[PDB]
Amino acid sequence: LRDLIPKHKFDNSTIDQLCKLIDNEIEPIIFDLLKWLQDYNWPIAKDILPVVVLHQSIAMPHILTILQGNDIMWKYWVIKLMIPYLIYPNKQLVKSELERLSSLEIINEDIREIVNLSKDYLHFYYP
Amino acid sequence: LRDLIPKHKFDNSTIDQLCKLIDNEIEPIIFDLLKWLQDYNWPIAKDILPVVVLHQSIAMPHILTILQGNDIMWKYWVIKLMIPYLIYPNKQLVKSELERLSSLEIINEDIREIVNLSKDYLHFYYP
């Protein structure tokens, strides 16, 4: 199934073949798929998004990981693109991460962007 | 199942009960659900989005309807919020609508917004 993971930044070749796979099925590669969301400007990232959203239930653990992670850009995309499409339980699963991130002291400027994304999403998707 | 449709603009009461329903199951109400996406600033609209995205396959016909529709704001939300999350076949199902909308002559200013949304989405999600 690993052959199903995009091998580079433009690799849309396996998508039609991932669209067939399901929740039980795709989980073994699901975190690798998410790695494509590190930069949304990769032409592949846009193709991957909908797949990882459809299969958001099996992706939750791994979505947490990314938010506890040390990639600023990665969790920024994951927050910006995915939170809005989490179903109530899943959406509630990440509240804590959004909470923590909104909390960080703004040392560098990249930190700012993601504090602000979190305050605003919390503000919008939780009221 | 119709009792499952939000009865007003803030009505989040049936969501947890819709999250249980599936593709075979929910289609009878799916177009009514979409009617909540007419204004995204309705507190309910944000809760509904993820449901109608998860069930995008049964929603396709009805997504077309809205794009051929006469609601500017409605198709604007539907385009802005949903296209980015359509899986390849579904995404290809609406290309024509995006194409047509990008084509409209800009008489009034509200028309502008949706021409521009369509050129830009076409430009981004199709390359």
Author numbering:
A (entry chain A), B (entry chain A): 4 to 130
Question: What does the study report here?
Answer:
Cthe_2751_is a 15.8 kDa singleton from an anaerobic, hyperthermophile Clostridium thermocellum, with an unknown function. Therefore, based on primary sequence analysis, Cthe_2751 is a non-Pfam singleton with an unknown function. Each monomer is made up of 8 α-helices arranged in a spiral pattern around a vertical axis that runs through the centre of the protein. The structure reveals an all α-helical topology similar to those observed for nucleic acid processing proteins.
Cthe_2751 crystallized as a dimer in 3 different crystal forms. Superimposition of the dimers crystallized in different space groups revealed no obvious differences in the position of the Cα atoms suggesting an identical mode of dimerization in all the 3 crystal forms. To find out if there is a difference in the packing arrangement of the dimers in the 3 crystal forms and to quantify it, a computer program was compiled and a calculation was performed to analyze the inter-dimer distances of 2 neighbouring dimers for all 3 space groups. As expected, the inter-dimer distance between 2 closest dimers in space groups C2221 and P4122 is relatively similar when compared to that of the distance between dimers of space groups P212121 and C2221 or P212121 and P4122, where there is almost no recognizable co-relationship. This result further supports the inferences of crystal packing analysis where we saw that the dimers rotate less than 3° along the C axes during the transformation from P4122 to C2221 resulting in only a minor change in crystal packing. A mathematical calculation performed on the dimers of Cthe_2751 crystallized in different space groups corroborated the findings of the crystal packing analysis of molecules packed in different space groups.
